[PDB]
Write a protein that binds this ligand. Structure first.
Ligand SMILES: OC[C@H]1O[C@@H](O[C@H]2[C@H](O)[C@H](O)[C@H](O[C@H]3[C@H](O)[C@H](O)[C@@H](O)O[C@@H]3CO)O[C@@H]2CO)[C@@H](O)[C@@H](O)[C@@H]1O
Ligand SMILES: [Zn+2]
Ligand SMILES: [Zn+2]
Ligand SMILES: [Zn+2]
Ligand SMILES: [Zn+2]
Length: 394
């Protein structure tokens, strides 16, 4: 009778896992059929507000981060969940992941998975350059040095890249914390200009050094046709074309599924000057129920079903994420996996930081992303690009 519409933000294995959860829920709940539709970035990432405004929204969404939540809640595009949570023991969640759900006194989402950011490196290419394959770079300067050893060009044309800073999870909203800063201040206002954020300038100048060594056009010719900031069976790490890449812990899966023989290492992101050792953003996927959801109660009951310690441990194992439920992270089979053990060591030892909470986060990110790309393409200097972004953001 009741038909639940759910949007999830990616295809591939994570997409399938979600579709399969919906399927198996609908089998044992004859009165609640779920229809799962892939909509990229859940139509939110810097279609969701279009459909809420039209009165037509899904009954439930899965977003791939935590950054959009304040903005959606401040506009009342998503509903507060307090009234549906008095029978849920929310202390079973990891505290940070749950803490991310609160905005001006109310809960507006539930964490679906936990994620970390890490450095991957290709052990075969390391051995080829005479580099110890279990010795990742610890600082950015070590990284830059290693990346020069691992880069092979023939008269300008690139045959092998050691490192590209802006691919994978090398994006401004992740990397700013690595350089020990943020895109917004404590009040949630944009801090993108050199004057307001000297560490951000340092980050961009670091990035632009790569496009000055190798040529922005050479780099872009080299990765033509490859996925850049979504990690797929066609990103340049998986293809064996970049020696090192910053990505999320899920990349373990994308590596294994594209090529099982690719010998790779996973470890902490290199420390940046002005930043902390082993820096890592910890975030996660989040469930939200939009203003206009026709069956919020059924939506919450699927979500609840979803969180069951064994089930969600099986899910986190399939997609290589961290289960947001304390007890389920402990039962995950991935706990024996050598690669996932290194990921866990990062969440344990690294200097963790979290997605900042600002109502204008997404537009600031857009201004920031545009300024990075402009200075990567020598259209403006880093100082000017960041000045212009500040104007764009305000
Ligand atoms: O691939 C499954 C894996 O995805 C994780 O979410 C990531 C997405 O897949 C994308 O890689 C996404 O990239 C976007 C950034 O968020 C920025 O908005 C901007 O750079 O645009 C890019 C391109 O879309 O990043 C998210 C992580 O924030 C995550 O859901 C994980 O659970 C899952 O296994
Ligand atoms: Zn598939
Ligand atoms: Zn963000
Ligand atoms: Zn209902
Ligand atoms: Zn039920």
């Amino acid at each position: 009778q009741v038909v639940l519409t759910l949007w999830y933000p990616w295809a591939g294995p994570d997409g399938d896992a979600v579709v399969s959860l919906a399927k198996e829920y609908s089998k044992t709940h004859p009165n609640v059929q779920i229809k799962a539709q892939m909509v990229s970035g859940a139509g939110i990432a810097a279609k969701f507000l279009s459909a809420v405004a039209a009165g037509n929204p899904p009954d439930l969404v899965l977003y791939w981060g935590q950054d959009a939540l304040p903005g959606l809640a401040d506009q009342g595009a998503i509903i507060p969940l307090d009234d549906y949570l008095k029978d849920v023991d929310t202390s079973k969640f990891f505290e940070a992941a749950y803490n991310a759900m609160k905005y001006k006194g109310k809960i507006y989402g539930l964490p679906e998975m936990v994620n970390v950011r890490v450095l991957f490196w290709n052990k075969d290419l390391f051995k080829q350059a005479g580099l110890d394959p279990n010795t990742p770079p610890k600082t950015i300067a070590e990284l830059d040095q290693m990346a020069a050893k691992l880069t092979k060009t023939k008269n300008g044309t690139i045959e092998q890249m050691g490192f590209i800073p802006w691919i994978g999870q090398g994006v401004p909203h992740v990397m700013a914390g690595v350089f020990g800063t943020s895109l917004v201040d404590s009040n949630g206002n944009p801090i993108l200009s050199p004057d307001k954020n000297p560490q951000l300038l340092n980050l961009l100048k670091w990035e632009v050094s790569y496009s000055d060594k190798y040529g922005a056009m050479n780099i872009n010719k080299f990765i033509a046709g490859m996925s850049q900031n979504s990690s797929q069976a066609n990103d340049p790490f998986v293809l064996g074309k970049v020696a090192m890449m910053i990505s999320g812990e899920w990349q373990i899966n994308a590596n294994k599924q594209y090529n099982p023989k690719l010998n790779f290492g996973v470890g902490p992101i290199p420390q940046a000057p002005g930043g902390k050792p082993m820096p890592s953003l910890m975030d996660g996927n989040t469930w939200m129920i939009p203003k206009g959801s026709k069956h919020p109660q059924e939506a919450m009951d699927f979500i609840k079903w979803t969180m069951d310690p064994q089930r969600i441990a099986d899910t986190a194992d399939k997609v290589y994420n961290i289960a947001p439920i304390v007890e389920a992270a402990k039962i995950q089979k991935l706990n024996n996996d050598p690669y996932f053990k290194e990921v866990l060591n990062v969440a344990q030892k690294g200097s963790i930081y979290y997605t900042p909470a600002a109502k204008g986060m997404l537009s600031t990110e857009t201004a920031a992303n545009n300024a990075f790309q402009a200075a990567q393409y020598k259209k403006s200097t880093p100082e000017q690009a960041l000045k212009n972004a500040q104007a764009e953001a305000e």
